[PDB]
Design an enzyme around this catalytic site. Sequence first.
Site, short mmCIF file in Angstrom:
data_model
loop_
_atom_site.label_atom_id
_atom_site.label_comp_id
_atom_site.label_asym_id
_atom_site.label_seq_id
_atom_site.Cartn_x
_atom_site.Cartn_y
_atom_site.Cartn_z
N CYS A 243 3.23 2.11 -3.18
CA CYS A 243 4.61 2.57 -3.16
C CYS A 243 5.42 1.77 -4.17
O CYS A 243 5.10 1.80 -5.36
CB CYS A 243 5.20 2.58 -1.75
SG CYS A 243 5.25 1.01 -0.90
N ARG A 248 5.67 0.69 2.50
CA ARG A 248 5.43 2.06 2.96
C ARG A 248 3.93 2.37 2.85
O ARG A 248 3.38 3.06 3.70
CB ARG A 248 6.26 3.08 2.16
CG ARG A 248 7.77 2.99 2.40
CD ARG A 248 8.56 3.91 1.46
NE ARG A 248 8.82 3.29 0.17
CZ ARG A 248 9.30 3.92 -0.90
NH1 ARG A 248 9.57 5.23 -0.85
NH2 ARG A 248 9.51 3.25 -2.04
#
Lengths: 292, 292
Positions: A243, A248
């Site tokens: 990410c 994430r």
Amino acid sequence: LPADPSPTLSAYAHPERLVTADWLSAHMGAPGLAIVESDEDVLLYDVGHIPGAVKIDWHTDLNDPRVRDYINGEQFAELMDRKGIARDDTVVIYGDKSNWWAAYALWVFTLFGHADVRLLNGGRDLWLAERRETTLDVPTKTCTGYPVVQRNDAPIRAFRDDVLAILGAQPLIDVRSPEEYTGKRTHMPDYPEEGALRAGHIPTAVHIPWGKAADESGRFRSREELERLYDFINPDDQTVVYCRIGERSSHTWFVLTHLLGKADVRNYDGSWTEWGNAVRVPIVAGEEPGVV
Amino acid sequence: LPADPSPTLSAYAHPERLVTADWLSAHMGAPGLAIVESDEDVLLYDVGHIPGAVKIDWHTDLNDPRVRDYINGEQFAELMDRKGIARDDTVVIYGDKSNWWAAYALWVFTLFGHADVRLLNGGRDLWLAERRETTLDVPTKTCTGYPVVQRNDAPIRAFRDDVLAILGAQPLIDVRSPEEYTGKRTHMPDYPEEGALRAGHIPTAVHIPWGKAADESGRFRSREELERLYDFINPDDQTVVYCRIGERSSHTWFVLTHLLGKADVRNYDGSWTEWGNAVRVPIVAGEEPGVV
């Protein structure tokens, strides 16, 4: 401690890797249970937390302050000792932002080979939504003797050059927003746009927003839903996820590794803040994965 | 065209590499003279510029829009053609911010082997301070036949791995502000702080702010002053210079290469936006160069 046998979890590949809020509440005060809050918001623990919970902050506790890397094994042992965590403890981690940093902390613990690390399903936000007990009290218990281990990056961490090597050869998953993936932005829509000199995705990367794996409550989706979502992944695949700063993608890393049971999944923690600032690395924009 | 023989310049190692405003004004309308404005402010040329001047913007004209690198030889030839610049032309470059981007443009031209490239001493700001003529008129002249050359990076450009290799072996010069050098900031004091995940300098780097080589008017300091400033540099040295995005370091690169006549000086254009975002590269903070 043993696994949560709740029917919500039994379908997952490693059901031992998640717990429910009811399980946790019941098992509070067990000697071998460590409860860790890990947030984006470094001062959120100070506002109120799960009783028995200690704070481990990803940037301040888990990162080297000078170099872009995690702490070493000696530092990790020192951290575990002062947080009251023993080597054989069950560590349950939870936090804000849909458990992103909680998953990231779990991943870091795995670097140091801590065996039993779990996430609280639905994290800090579900706990509060269900009006469960919080406290301002900080645990005092400290331990000694946590082993100084070899940090073991290779199995679960991918570096810039590793990613360059597998382009076209292995599944590469970009878990960011569509704005980030297509090259309109270098950060999430509701975050200040500032971090990278180039925008786009890594060639061949496919777009699967991290959030497709969780529901409205922050809980992970069912085995059935997750199987469909990542059905394109085959047993011999060495999947890489990325990410912006790896948070994430650690969420997706956790979904693939523990809920789906996929092997050889690596988090490219360098992510876009590295890639989009590196001189002469391939970048493609728009909606197509792109090639070579 | 021949060199400016002005006494202000004669002491420099390559006096052919600078011109005075009086020289330029006199030589306007010569066929073999190209005048290029290169600014930080991409829209500053549009407000008024030196008569005969064309705009070459470093980001939009000289950079690849997708990858972090410059354009290729085919693109450069196309650019020269449409800007009316011939291979044998004398190119005089000037701009705002103390000629930072003008020096950077000169450096980029050198990548493509354009032989006669010069800076206007004191740049755009001195020109305006001395109330010399500006215009909104844009030159129309276009050419064809600029050669498609091999871009020649190695002599004047250093990459991340090159820098890692010479740590302790060669002079490394950080040309940024003291705030940036010591690790208090990742950008200049009057610029929004946002670009790198780590702050500091590259180990062994010595701190010599780019501005020590220019006076209040924006003009370069005398040979004598510059000799003292960089007296620590020896004939066999392969000096590397860096900043944040390579613009201030190209200014120093120009000072060392052309005004002092030092050989094998390279600009590490990746600079801090690359280095301070790269995973697991050595970084030191505070006032000491640091070691290994």
